[PDB]
Design a protein around this ligand. Structure first.
Ligand SMILES: C[C@@H]1CC(=O)N(C)N=C1c1ccc(NC(=O)N2Cc3cccnc3C2)cc1
Ligand SMILES: C[C@@H]1CC(=O)N(C)N=C1c1ccc(NC(=O)N2Cc3cccnc3C2)cc1
Lengths: 467, 467
């Protein structure tokens, strides 16, 4: 990795575009508010600080590599060799940068400063926005963690209404999205952002990232159970679906086992194969080792409601304290196809209307959880708010005529507790008046060293639901 | 990187789920047909073969790391230590796998075999689908390359109608999506997939991936020009937008320069600042070094049409051979906000309706180009089609009752030229009859060695538009 090749091309030319005699460029990141995701989980910055920004990031070889590449890329010699050499010689290749950030796991309303960046050496005014591209990728873990947590709110609300408790809440949305993300690296980041809110994952890459960059008291942050795919059923031949089911549940008789049942006909599998032919292998299983039946095709709501109606008539169904129907403890369902925040809400409301407890079901989400997200969802944005030119500080901003929603904040920023216990961002250095107590941002990075870190345990505690 | 921790958790348990006495598992990847992306660019497999699959991928330390992690992850000892040890001892940690693939750059209609995977050792039946997760991530570079190319078709069609040529087509869609993707790795893969079709990029990460894994005769596969951001304008102070514009165009007087002009009022910037105050610096510029005015806010179509109307009345507009209006060669426009395949089509059709040539404009796309894409768009899918159990080959498939569109192909597959010059996938080993030509799939991977490679130059040639 070469930080000199880890920015937008145009930023290579920016050191020649600022006003001459500029000693300071001070920039900030926010989840810009709109005209519905009203609060965001801050998670991911620490990963980036440690992997890409900290220590000796500049060498004589990296400056040369970059000079050679940009000479051909621009068909011109615009690369700032002198500026990068200054960093190598003065600070042994350590970035003269101060980053202040909200603590990780913190749940902040839209339109508040989450972190600030500035240069600590007047020579390195250009460096602040060089690293915009790297720092803005914070959007991804922030967004995954926020959208995961909003899904937990929906599951929590319906599990409480239909069961009267939150038992198993942290295992009800399982990460299926390893194959569905753009890269191995994305898989690690995304799975880690999900585990802020839940404990169930099949995206193994997430575990090593958490261990290396955050840490947990427990040996692993995430857990899984044995489960079939279409290959492990269909390999037996079309006329031997029963022989496949029997072999799989018998191999995993004393642990929970998920078996995809839609290879040929989901409704036949539930009613005839599970419901009659193999009934005797299901009803004998322990409460700690249920069969979990997995549909994976058709309208998600309609398929879940019909599978439950089928199983309710073949197995001894009970009625819980609140009047909702419950399968026996050895039998559960998981819907692992077409699950996003929208269809999740559709299914649990649909199940509630037909008097089925949410105790009965868990969800698998892949693309909906880790891939079908953009920087646009929470308006994740990095902008310059304050510069010092000719020894004079100026409050700086954009305010486009045709979009007031893209207006940026002015001057040096500070995050404060209101008297009612909410958050406010003070602009124009007004935090120095100390009318709102102390700044809630901490220095997390300074002059190539990480100065403050959080365990994955702390982050989980900060990210807890109200209830 | 540890390939033993680079799969879906549930696949760790699959070696116990296949029929006993299974010596072969043969699986295939396709872009499944629907009930409108009719043809896909095959690109990305080679990257994955070299980075993750080739050579000694298994060590005594990696088997132990995996055994320790999975023991805690499952709260059970399910990990196949024996199977992974066999690969270490017999093949010096080299994967006993054969992968056949269509050549990279190839444009194939939906629902055709793109690559096949199988084990070369009867012991390693389980290995074929272990690597599904890693191989299926091919969806991302395939999808980016396909969607980029469809956008090139739209640009090509309207540039021809309005100008009568394709001059500068390969520079008209510029990659802005470095900050908008989920990771550094994704940035590299995505930018590389775009450069299959175009030569303009700001996602620098793409250049090193191409050089390392593919190669070009040319020194670099992608190019860029100097450009401003809001920071390099707004840093001058609200009342000095003119002083900023003048400084920037003067610094980059002999090369093309992009200047974002919407910081406060885009319409004022075009009509008064560019159109009157600084007119004398624009009209003096060379045809090889134009000013490119950049709006970045408001309705994309409406803003482009109004900026052009403004500039058409302040600058000497010509009428080309085909009756469409053309700015002087020293003045061009780029729309770099809210550009996806849909809005791209909206704008060029809108410009055509108002008799503006597509010569006038180029596009910047970030999230639309590299992030706002899923595995669902082209139905990228990996399925088992053929097994050998008890020495007997079986043709295998899924066929869900409630979704015929998820039906998979049967038996050993082969890709052929039809007599009319189209593609067909033969099922059930029917390719072994010589009734069609040669199989177009070539062995690209066998027993830990990459056996066939393509230059980025070859891939570009294969991916060309007809015309
Ligand atoms: C163990 C949890 C808890 C629970 O209460 N229920 C009902 N279900 C659980 C569960 C059910 C199923 C799985 N795993 C799966 O079905 N997988 C794993 C997986 C990964 C990627 C693509 N497809 C699949 C199929 C994982 C956990
Ligand atoms: C030079 C190309 C070719 C051409 O014909 N036109 C009209 N425009 C071109 C061009 C126009 C603009 C740029 N670059 C930019 O405006 N950038 C670069 C960039 C990257 C990420 C986010 N924002 C920006 C702003 C690069 C190339």
């Amino acid at each position: 990795f070469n930080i000199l090749l880890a920015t937008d091309s145009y930023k290579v030319t920016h050191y020649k575009q600022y006003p001459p005699n500029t000693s300071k460029v001070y920039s900030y990141f926010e989840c810009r508010e709109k005209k519905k995701y009203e609060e965001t989980v801050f998670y991911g910055l620490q990963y980036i600080l440690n992997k890409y920004l900290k220590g000796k990031v500049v060498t004589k070889e990296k400056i040369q590599e970059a000079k050679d590449v940009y000479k051909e890329h621009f068909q011109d010699d615009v690369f700032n060799e002198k500026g990068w050499n200054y960093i190598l010689e003065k600070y042994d290749g350590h970035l003269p940068i101060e980053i202040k950030a909200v603590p990780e796991g913190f749940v902040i309303p839209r339109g508040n400063v989450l972190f600030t960046v500035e240069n600590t050496d007047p020579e390195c005014y250009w460096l602040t926005n060089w690293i915009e591209t790297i720092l803005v990728q914070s959007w991804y873990p922030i967004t995954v963690a926020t959208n995961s947590r909003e899904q937990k709110k929906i599951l929590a609300k319906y599990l409480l209404e239909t069961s009267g408790n939150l038992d198993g809440l942290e295992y009800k949305l399982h990460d299926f999205g390893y194959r569905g993300v753009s890269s191995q690296e994305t898989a690690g980041i995304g799975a880690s952002a999900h585990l802020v809110n839940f404990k169930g994952t099949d995206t193994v890459a997430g575990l090593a990232l958490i261990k290396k960059y955050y840490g947990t008291k427990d040996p692993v942050p995430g857990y899984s159970v044995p489960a079939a795919e279409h290959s492990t059923i269909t390999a037996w031949g079309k006329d031997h679906e029963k022989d496949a089911f029997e072999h799989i549940v018998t191999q995993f008789s004393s642990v929970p086992v998920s078996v995809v049942s839609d290879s040929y006909d989901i409704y036949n599998a539930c009613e005839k194969i599970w419901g009659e032919d193999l009934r005797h292998l299901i009803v004998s299983r322990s409460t700690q080792a249920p069969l979990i039946i997995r549909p994976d095709s058709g309208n998600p709501l309609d398929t879940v409601l019909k599978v439950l109606e089928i199983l309710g008539k073949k197995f001894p169904v009970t009625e819980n304290s609140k009047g909702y129907k419950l399968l026996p403890p050895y039998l559960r369902v998981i819907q692992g196809d077409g699950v996003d925040i929208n269809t999740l809400q559709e299914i649990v409301e649909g199940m509630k209307q037909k008097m089925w407890s949410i105790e009965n079901i868990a969800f698998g989400s892949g693309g909906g959880l880790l891939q079908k997200l953009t920087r646009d969802l929470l308006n994740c944005s990095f902008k310059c708010s304050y510069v010092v030119t000719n020894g004079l500080g100026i409050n700086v901003f954009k305010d486009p005529v045709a979009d007031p929603n893209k207006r940026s904040k002015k001057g040096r920023l500070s995050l404060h507790r209101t008297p009612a216990g909410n958050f406010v961002t003070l602009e124009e250095g007004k935090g120095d008046l100390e009318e709102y107590g102390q700044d809630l941002l901490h220095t997390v990075f300074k002059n190539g060293k990480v100065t403050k870190s959080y365990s994955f345990d702390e982050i989980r505690k900060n990210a807890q639901l109200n209830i």
